[PDB]
Design a protein around this ligand. Structure first.
Ligand SMILES: [Mg+2]
Ligand SMILES: [Zn+2]
Lengths: 222, 115, 56, 1112, 150, 170, 93, 56, 57
């Protein structure tokens, strides 16, 4: 029931390596030249760092601050560009009317370990969710028909099926496969995900999507 | 003063690289929207408070303010337009005017615009 | 008078440019040092570029 | 009372931290130094170098320069909007090479700004600051080729603007093509005029091998020194003819000329001891009787080719190495502009000679003022390192003038920053603060000078290290440079210092900055104090070693954002520095000797000094500062007593009792109070407003000149044509407002009145005038009102009439006025506030003293901050700051905990054990006992483990007490809290940004003259920007018309924005827009490039963009 | 993204790429007015070929063209987009020379054009929507019989 | 830049619903001047437009008469509140104007996350959707209470904040 | 959380279609000063004010609650735009 | 114990099995309640809450 | 294509880059103004040289 523990453990504030440098040790620091140092920093922030540990830390710390703070601007370089190429993308035809489509695996081969395992939950959700079926599906009794709108439930159903080895490929409607001129279509796109329902026809889907990809931009340093 | 040349609108203001000189200048050339309505208001409110004037002392009260053809019409000509004399129109304006002053001081509808 | 759904852009010709113009400004004098009013040929000229005061 | 801690006693105190500004500027002044013994460096270098000015000719030489007496004191300037500058006279002699006319005359230069005591200058009444510039020290250097790893490219470089770049690159052509001033050419082309032919080219080169081939060339070496002197000159200058005498002059002036090439004394020094040579002047070569001998190029070239070989000792140099990087100081900077700005007059001298009356012209007609004067003022105003002084508080100016700017005209930019000049070199240490830097995109650019760090005339920042021998503390304090430091073994201030010797075998040490636990005896140096490892503000944070550097940075910078309070109070937990802070900042007035306070007089504090003389120091009580927070000297000295020399007399704005007092120590409960303190938010008790805590006063400047237009001038009076009765209230004589009058936003200050531009009133308006009868008078109202949101009271009444003594106004302007307006502001809702540990926040509402999580003693908490931004920001210092506060408030004694050396867990634990042990006395003694609610909480803890079971509540509440926590009730309910909540005194501060100012909203205001868009900032009174990101955000949702209004109706569109006000005023719906008017601009704009702007409609047809306008 | 912990959805990313490769290169123009090595959007070539098959002519042969997002945005049919984008100098020339007609196909072009955006509520799909209350609705429901007999 | 708009710092909304935002009095006044000018036209007190205009535009003398009158045009229509940068479309959400004291601006703590907000002194701006059409847009697809799911995930946005989580968990 | 939201969105297909309907109707409610509406004095928007509790003048809300009944008709190509302004701006002043 | 994730799943499942306004109110309920729920406990952070493992 | 070589000069309207005074007594001008100025100066002096019969250089 400790406040610090529960704090991050519940999902409020804090992360594991962050707690480590509080109740534990702060961990060996890195040199700005890029080669990590050869001496640890031991004592936690609660214990307090000696002048050395603190300076030696300040190296890669004040370094990192500059890393993130620098990439902040780079986010614009990404976003703006993505905007200028997505502006002309809107959902016009409800029906694009193409037999074209693409399939995604529910398993990603672990390199050098071979043996295709499975994509973690969020991963499958990362493009099966809110989709629209391209073709018939048969597994474990009840079969999906042509056209159904995949929901967070349907996705899990696909997982269950995949484990049964009855399904691997997932035929869906992609923006690529869409014949909607200067934009996409209902089927080819999907749920409005902010409404968890089919995207409103006339929506800024591409244009919105740009923002969707751009927002995470300042958050990837590594 | 004369000697001193003009000033480039691209001259940076402050110490930061954003601010421009020209972007710091207002536009009073065109009447502001607040003035669009302020003026269009008086142009009407003076039309309704005018109708309480005789068919002569009104249509004539406009000709002396450049309200009619936009150019001002002197007393001499107004008296020629109504068939009256360079004297009659003169008193007409006086009385017609203050006769409106009573309606103004009693309705407070136009009592603003005193700048 | 007509819904504008289209806007093109292209090159212009010396003639078309002559048409766009209301006159040929010559003198470098922006405005007088005294009257600060548009010079005869001044860049800011009020003679062929239209009045600074509405209808006046 | 007070209590100190730690066993690390600073041996040597902190040097005058304001000297890096003052002293360094003093060298370049030499005001007292006679015009003989002047050091020739700095200001006398501008004369030494730019003289004699020659042309049967003229030999005009330099003699002296008279140090001017300030015309107007630093005060007069600040109130006259004039620069604090003094006429610098100059004495010289004009002679002729033939006539022998020795004609001498004392000419005059211009006016040079003078520095104050603190280290800031005065520019047009606004005080500014000259920061420091950083770059690799001049000299020679060697680094691997950025285009190839297999070799090593070297280079040479003097002081900026005092000489051109130098580098000898090795192209992939196998030859060696040196590149200087952006162009390539083989080394032979140099050696030609250097006195080294084909023979001398192979003499010592064979000690290399493959390096003897890349140099030798027959197509060149057949050309002796004056023979090919012109050859390289042709490639150098495509314009001027390849004359044999032009290459005798130009190229010469670029090398052997110490006046056009100033190779900094450091460069002439540092480079001298590496390469193994004797270079005399600041030159490269020597103009020795005709051809040009070599003092530099060969001795560096052998090193360049030595490293690329692998021979021991010749190696790459560290570019970021502090020992290789000098600092441009105030005098060293100002002098830089004095010289070039003097040469700009040197040519103006040589030109005014070749004509007129060559017989005898006094140098008075020859010399000029403007070419020098304006050249200096240029740097003293529009340069980078000349920035607006920070007076937001006393510490502001201190740190501000103590910062190091990597920027400036002179060697870096926002582009080549990537890591190198951003990151922190291993040797930073006791030179520059590894943390305190702008948190913005400028990180690692503007740093701050370390405590004991000093910058000598050589630019090599040096750090104190207490010398030690045989493991014994020596009283010999060495200022060892960032260079030498990379040689010896430096111990640490936290080393086992006992009985003036080393205790434990394993001692803290390092070489070049690499941690090593080595034997005691071998310790040649040590760290004087941990304080030097950081900057000023950095060392103002207690238990800072517990706070992650990240937020600690903000904690250090925000020290400046903080604002003084009339009633403010020094932190009950200090580091033992803040004392001197107020002294060295010169923000406090002490006694020059041992005085005797005679008459306090909150204006004039007199102290009859022991020296028998009677001296008094007037007080600055309540006077405007560069931002809002005034300066105050609160007399703390009784109307008589004998003071001590150096003892304080009158306080300062952030200075309480000679201590740095930013905010006021306040008890804070760490807990989620109704989600009000959620996510670095703040909560405050009304009880603070009662005692007027964190409340300040802000003065502002309001000026207006009586404009003299073409239509004719005007005046500031009380008369106004349409003005009403009351609106004239405090105008009493000349149209000014009396002192101490409240001006709510919307009121006025002065009386400006000018003839309106005469224009016939609109017809409706003409009749409107006739009806009522107030005529349209010649003159219309002008007078300057007060800004929307700065309600003050008038204090400074400053009038300046044209035609008065010591006032020169603008050319053709009448009387002006600058009125001061001051206002008291209590802590408002949403005002920025932070602790010393770098935890930002805005006051979220307030809270009735009635409802408060008080304690058994009936003392309600005054703030209550949520424990959210503690773990993520790792601010564990604030935890101790408040933890001590618990015992602090109870025992009434303050603390001193130096950074990294201070009170620890056992110590604090004891202070809290005593705190509780005494607290119980005011309970059981006062006739009370253990409360039931207390039992509730105690039991809960006994279940959680916070209090060991089997122990009575007396022991449990005690253990919970030393934990920093206690039993808190709820002033809203009265029931206690399930868990305990830490509390106690903490140092916090109300930051600069206050909603009282920033917050703004407009309806329909002015617009940019160009396009009908509004105006950014609350200043010009305009709306915010909807820039492209916002537009896209709208496109996302799919709100069309919302975007329409943005692009047209609610922004720019001509008839649209008006039709809007029309509709809304008439209670209806606004029509859909048409012409954005900005776009209309774009049309003709493109047309100016002969771009036919063809607008089509619904089917490929003409459209008239500009309604009936340009249709000709 | 999944590495850094971003729950981002495939659709978006897909649209992007769709824009990247949506252009093709002209190879053996066949019977068309095109030239070997010219470039244009997938829909254009697809259309012209679809028509060519009916006209009897041989379809235009081609090969996929994968370019960068920037380059794509600068090659888009709408000249306005690239005009407001960047490298403005080069863009305007290329447009003006051939006299490029922007129909405001995209939104940003309309943004600058200060007109009703073809997307959102402004979408030509719903912007023509009508609204009537019962009373007035059945008021106008009768009027069509006032023009048939008269 | 636009007309009818402004900015200020931010303050948490512990009593505030998803569709709510604290809007300062003195702010909302000059923000809604064109509207209130009509609601004052209708509701007696000053005879006409200019009357009310100069009436309130002068001094600080705002009587309760104009307070309630202002609230009459406030209820219903909701104003858009934005926080820079505009990265996620959620960086702009529509909320119901709530006349409140003080200077700073309130807001729902759950949506602040989508705005990348924290109360360090952050400054948010505000605009007003004038035309009925646009206003409608503001209250429906543009409204905050409406879009609760992240368009880049499908997962919620207005999900419990760092604090609330700690409470419910506890 | 405008009442009937779920039902509102659920009525039409897209979001925009709905917004457009609410828009045009809300405007129509203003052009006729509320004497058009298909609702009843109990159903009409109610704004509670200290002075008196009147009908909420907000057009938007008017249209909002208006569609919830369904008495209103919509969709493209409904009736000729011509006679739609002859029998609309006539029946009400 | 209902922590972040569980709450998340609750929000989704609700918004899908219920509707916009309904779940809108639901959220605010957990907000207003959670704030006070946390308030009563208060759960402060002391230096002694940072306790170091004996295995260090 | 010959249009690329232009005889006329499309001169932008005056009010699009004006010169207007501000408070304090001094005026302010756009950059494009002085640019256009240098343009006509050379343009006129050229004519002056032409009819003059000045040499090729
Ligand atoms: Mg912030
Ligand atoms: Zn499709």
């Amino acid at each position: 029931f400790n406040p610090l523990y529960v704090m991050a453990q519940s999902g409020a504030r804090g992360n594991p390596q962050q707690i480590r440098q509080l109740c534990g040790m702060r961990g060996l620091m890195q040199k700005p030249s890029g080669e990590t140092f050869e001496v640890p920093v031991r004592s936690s922030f609660r214990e307090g760092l000696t002048v050395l540990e603190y300076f030696i830390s300040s190296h890669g710390a004040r370094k990192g601050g500059a890393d993130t703070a620098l990439r902040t601007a780079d986010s614009g370089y990404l976003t703006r560009k993505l905007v200028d190429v997505a502006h002309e993308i809107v959902v016009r035809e409800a029906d694009c009317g193409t037999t074209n489509y693409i399939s995604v695996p529910l398993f990603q081969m672990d390199e050098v370990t071979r043996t295709l395992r499975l994509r973690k939950r969020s991963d499958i959700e990362s493009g099966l969710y809110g989709r629209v079926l391209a073709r018939e599906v048969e597994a474990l009794g009840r079969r999906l028909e042509e056209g159904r709108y995949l929901s967070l439930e349907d996705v899990h159903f696909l997982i269950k099926a995949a484990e049964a080895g009855e399904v691997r490929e997932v035929p869906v409607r992609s923006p690529l496969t869409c014949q909607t001129r200067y934009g996409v279509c209902q089927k080819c796109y999907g749920y409005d995900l902010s409404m968890a329902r089919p995207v409103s026809i006339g929506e800024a889907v591409g244009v919105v999507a740009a923002e969707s990809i751009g927002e995470p931009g300042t958050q990837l340093t590594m | 003063k004369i000697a001193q040349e003009p000033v480039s609108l691209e001259t940076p203001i402050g110490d930061e690289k954003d601010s421009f000189y020209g972007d710091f200048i207002p536009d009073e050339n065109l009447p502001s929207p607040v003035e669009a309505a302020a003026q269009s208001l008086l142009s009407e409110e003076l039309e309704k408070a005018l109708s309480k004037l005789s068919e002569r002392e009104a249509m004539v009260l406009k000709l002396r303010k450049g309200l009619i053809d936009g150019r001002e019409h002197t007393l001499e000509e107004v008296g020629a337009y109504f068939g009256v004399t360079r004297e009659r129109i003169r008193q007409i304006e006086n009385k017609a005017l203050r006769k409106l002053k009573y309606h103004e001081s009693r309705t407070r509808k136009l009592r603003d615009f005193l700048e | 008078k007509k819904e504008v759904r289209k806007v093109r852009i292209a090159l212009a010709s010396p003639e078309k440019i002559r048409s766009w113009s209301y006159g040929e400004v010559e003198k470098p004098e922006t405005i007088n040092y005294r009257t600060l009013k548009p010079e005869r040929d001044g860049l800011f000229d009020e003679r062929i570029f239209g009045p600074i005061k509405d209808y006046e | 009372e007070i209590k100190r801690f730690g066993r690390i006693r600073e041996v040597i105190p902190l040097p005058p931290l304001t000297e890096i500004q003052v002293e360094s500027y003093k060298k370049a002044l030499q005001a007292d130094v006679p015009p003989e013994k002047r050091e020739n460096v700095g200001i006398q270098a501008a004369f030494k170098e730019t003289f004699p000015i020659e042309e049967g000719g003229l030999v005009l030489d330099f003699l002296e320069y008279r140090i001017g007496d300030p015309p107007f004191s630093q005060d007069e300037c600040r109130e006259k909007d004039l620069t604090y500058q003094a006429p610098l006279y100059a004495r010289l002699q004009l002679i002729h090479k033939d006539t022998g006319l020795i004609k001498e005359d004392e000419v005059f230069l211009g006016h040079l700004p003078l520095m104050t005591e603190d280290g800031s200058f005065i520019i047009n009444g606004a005080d500014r600051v000259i920061v420091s510039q950083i770059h690799r020290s001049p000299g020679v250097y060697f680094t691997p080729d950025p285009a190839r790893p297999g070799r090593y490219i070297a280079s040479i470089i003097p002081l900026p603007k005092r000489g051109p770049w130098i580098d000898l690159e090795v192209e992939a052509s196998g030859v060696v093509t040196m590149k200087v001033n952006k162009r390539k050419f083989p080394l032979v082309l140099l050696l030609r005029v250097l006195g080294y032919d084909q023979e001398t080219l192979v003499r010592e080169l064979s000690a290399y091998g493959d390096l003897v081939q890349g140099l030798l060339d027959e197509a060149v070496l057949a050309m002796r020194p004056e023979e090919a002197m012109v050859r390289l000159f042709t490639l150098l200058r495509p314009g001027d003819p390849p004359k044999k005498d032009k290459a005798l002059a130009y190229l010469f002036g670029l090398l052997a000329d110490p006046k056009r090439y100033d190779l900094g004394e450091a460069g002439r020094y540092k480079a001298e001891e590496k390469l193994g040579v004797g270079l005399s002047g600041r030159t490269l070569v020597r103009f020795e009787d005709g051809e040009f001998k070599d003092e530099v190029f060969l001795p560096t070239l052998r090193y360049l080719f030595a490293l690329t070989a692998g021979v021991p000792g010749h190696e790459v140099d560290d570019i970021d190495h502090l020992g290789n990087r000098r600092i441009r100081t105030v005098g060293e900077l100002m002098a830089d502009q004095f010289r070039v700005g003097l040469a700009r007059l040197a040519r103006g001298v040589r030109e005014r000679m070749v004509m007129g009356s060559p017989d005898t012209l006094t140098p008075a007609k020859l010399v000029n003022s403007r070419p020098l004067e304006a050249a200096l003022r240029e740097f003293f105003s529009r340069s980078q390192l000349s920035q607006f002084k920070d007076e937001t508080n006393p510490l502001s100016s201190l740190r501000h003038k103590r910062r190091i700017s990597a920027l400036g005209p002179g060697g870096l930019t926002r582009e080549r920053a990537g890591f190198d000049v951003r990151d922190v070199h291993r040797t930073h240490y006791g030179r520059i603060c590894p943390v305190e830097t702008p948190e913005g995109a400028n990180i690692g650019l503007i740093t701050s000078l370390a405590a004991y760090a000093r910058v000598d005339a050589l630019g090599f920042i040096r750090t104190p290290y207490r010398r030690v021998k045989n493991g014994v503390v020596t009283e010999e304090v060495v200022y060892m440079t960032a260079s030498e430091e990379d040689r010896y073994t430096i111990a640490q201030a936290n080393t086992p210092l006992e009985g003036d010797r080393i205790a434990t075998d394993r001692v803290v040490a390092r070489r070049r900055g690499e941690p090593v636990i080595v034997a005691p005896e071998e310790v040649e140096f040590m760290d004087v104090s941990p304080k030097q490892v950081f900057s000023l503000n950095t060392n103002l944070i207690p238990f800072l070693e517990h706070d992650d550097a990240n937020r600690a940075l903000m904690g250090s910078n925000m020290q400046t954002q903080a604002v003084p309070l009339i009633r403010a109070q020094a932190p009950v937990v200090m580091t033992g520095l803040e004392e001197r802070v107020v002294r060295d900042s010169l923000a406090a007035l002490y006694a020059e000797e041992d005085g005797e306070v005679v008459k306090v007089d909150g204006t004039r504090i007199a102290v009859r000094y022991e020296d028998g003389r009677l001296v008094e120091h007037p007080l600055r009580r309540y006077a405007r500062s560069n931002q809002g927070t005034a300066f105050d000297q609160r007399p703390r000295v009784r109307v008589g007593q004998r003071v001590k020399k150096g003892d304080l007399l009158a306080d300062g704005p952030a200075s309480e009792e000679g201590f740095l007092a930013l905010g006021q120590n306040v008890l804070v409960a760490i807990m989620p109070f109704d989600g009000y303190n959620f996510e670095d938010a703040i909560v405050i008790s009304e009880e603070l407003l009662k005692r007027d805590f964190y409340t300040s006063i802000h003065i502002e400047r309001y000026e207006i000149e009586a404009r003299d237009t073409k239509l004719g001038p005007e005046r500031i009076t009380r008369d106004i044509p349409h003005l009403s009765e009351a609106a004239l209230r405090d105008l009493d004589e000349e149209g000014i407002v009396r002192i101490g009058a409240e001006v709510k936003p919307g009121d006025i200050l002065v009386g400006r009145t000018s003839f309106k531009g005469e224009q016939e009133p609109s017809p409706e308006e003409r009749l409107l005038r006739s009806i009522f009868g107030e005529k349209a008078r010649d003159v219309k109202d002008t007078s300057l009102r007060v800004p929307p949101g700065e309600g003050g009271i008038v204090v400074g009444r400053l009038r300046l009439r044209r035609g008065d003594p010591g006032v020169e106004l603008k050319p053709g302007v009448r009387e002006v006025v600058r009125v001061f307006v001051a206002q008291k502001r209590k802590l408002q809702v949403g005002d920025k506030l932070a602790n010393r540990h770098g935890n930002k926040g805005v006051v979220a509402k307030i809270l009735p003293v009635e409802d408060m999580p008080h304690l058994p003693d009936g003392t309600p908490v005054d703030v209550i901050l949520n424990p959210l931004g503690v773990p993520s920001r790792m601010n564990l210092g604030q935890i101790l700051e408040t933890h001590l506060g618990l015992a602090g408030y109870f025992l009434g004694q303050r603390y001193i905990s130096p950074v990294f050396d201070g009170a620890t867990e056992p110590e604090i634990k004891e202070l809290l054990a005593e705190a509780f042990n005494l607290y119980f006395g005011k309970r059981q003694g006062e006739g009370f006992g253990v409360d039931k609610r207390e039992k509730e909480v105690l039991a809960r803890a006994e279940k959680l483990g916070l209090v060991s079971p089997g122990k009575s509540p007396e022991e449990q509440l005690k253990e919970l007490f030393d934990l920093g926590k206690v039993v808190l009730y709820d002033g809203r309910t009265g029931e206690p809290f399930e868990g305990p909540i830490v509390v106690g005194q903490m140092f916090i501060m109300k930051l600069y940004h206050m909603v009282e100012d920033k917050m703004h909203a407009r309806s329909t205001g002015p617009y940019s003259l160009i396009t009908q868009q509004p105006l950014g900032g609350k200043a010009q009174f305009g709306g915010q920007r909807f820039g492209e990101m916002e537009v896209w955000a709208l496109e996302a949702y799919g709100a069309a018309h919302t975007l329409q209004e943005m692009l047209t109706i609610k922004s720019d569109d001509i008839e649209g924005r008006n039709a809007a006000y029309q509709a809304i005023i008439k209670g209806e719906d606004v029509p859909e827009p048409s012409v954005p008017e900005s776009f209309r601009v774009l049309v003709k704009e493109l047309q100016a490039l002969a771009l036919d702007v063809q607008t089509l409609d619904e089917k490929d047809n003409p459209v008239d963009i500009f309604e009936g306008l340009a249709s000709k | 993204y999944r590495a850094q912990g971003v729950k981002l959805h495939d659709k978006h990313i897909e649209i992007v790429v769709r824009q990247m490769l949506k252009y093709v290169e002209v190879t053996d123009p066949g019977d068309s007015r095109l030239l070997e090595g010219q470039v244009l959007e997938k829909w254009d070539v697809e259309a012209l070929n679809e028509r060519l098959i009916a006209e009897g002519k041989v379809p235009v042969a081609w090969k996929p063209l994968l370019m960068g997002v920037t380059k794509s945005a600068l090659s888009t049919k709408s000249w306005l987009s690239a005009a407001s984008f960047q490298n403005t100098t080069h863009v305007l020339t290329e447009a003006a020379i051939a006299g490029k007609k922007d129909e405001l196909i995209g939104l940003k072009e309309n943004v600058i054009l200060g007109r009703l955006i073809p997307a959102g509520t402004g979408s030509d799909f719903v912007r023509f929507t009508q609204v009537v209350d019962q009373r007035t609705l059945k008021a106008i429901e009768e009027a069509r019989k006032e023009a048939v007999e008269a | 830049r636009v007309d009818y708009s402004g900015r200020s710092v931010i303050v948490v909304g512990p009593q505030l619903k998803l569709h709510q935002c604290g809007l300062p009095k003195r702010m909302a006044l000059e923000l809604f001047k064109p509207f209130l000018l009509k609601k004052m036209e209708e509701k007696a007190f000053a005879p006409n437009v200019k009357a009310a205009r100069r009436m309130l535009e002068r001094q600080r003398d705002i009587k309760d008469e104009v307070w309630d009158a202002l609230e009459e045009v406030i209820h219903g229509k909701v104003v858009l509140l934005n926080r820079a940068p505009t990265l996620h479309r959620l960086g702009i959400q529509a909320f119901q104007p709530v006349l409140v004291e003080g200077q700073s601006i309130q807001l729902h703590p759950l949506v602040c996350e989508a705005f990348n907000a924290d109360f360090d002194g952050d400054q948010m701006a505000v605009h007003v959707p004038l035309s009925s059409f646009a206003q409608a847009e503001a209250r429906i697809q543009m409204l905050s209470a409406h879009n609760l799911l992240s368009p880049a995930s499908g997962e919620p946005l207005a999900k419990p904040s760092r604090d609330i989580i700690l409470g419910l968990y506890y | 959380a405008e009442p009937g939201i779920d039902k509102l969105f659920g009525m039409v297909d897209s979001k925009y279609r709905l917004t457009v309907v609410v828009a045009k109707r809300a405007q129509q409610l203003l052009r006729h000063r509320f004497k058009n509406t298909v609702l009843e004095p109990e159903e009409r928007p109610k704004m509670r004010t200290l002075e008196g509790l009147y009908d909420d003048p907000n057009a938007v809300t008017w249209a909002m609650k208006e569609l919830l009944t369904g008495r209103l008709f919509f969709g493209e190509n409904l009736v000729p735009e011509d006679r739609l302004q002859k029998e609309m701006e006539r029946l009400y002043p | 114990p209902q922590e972040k994730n569980s709450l998340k799943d609750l929000v989704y499942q609700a918004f899908l099995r219920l509707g916009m306004e309904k779940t809108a109110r639901l959220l605010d309920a957990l907000k207003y309640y959670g704030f006070t729920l946390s308030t009563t406990s208060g759960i402060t952070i002391g230096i002694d809450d940072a306790v170091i493992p004996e295995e260090k | 294509p010959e249009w690329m070589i232009l005889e006329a000069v499309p001169v932008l309207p005056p009010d699009l880059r004006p010169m207007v005074q501000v408070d304090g007594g001094r005026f302010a001008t756009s950059d494009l103004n002085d640019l256009y100025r240098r343009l006509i100066n050379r343009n006129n002096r050229l004519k002056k040289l032409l009819a003059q019969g000045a040499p090729e250089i």
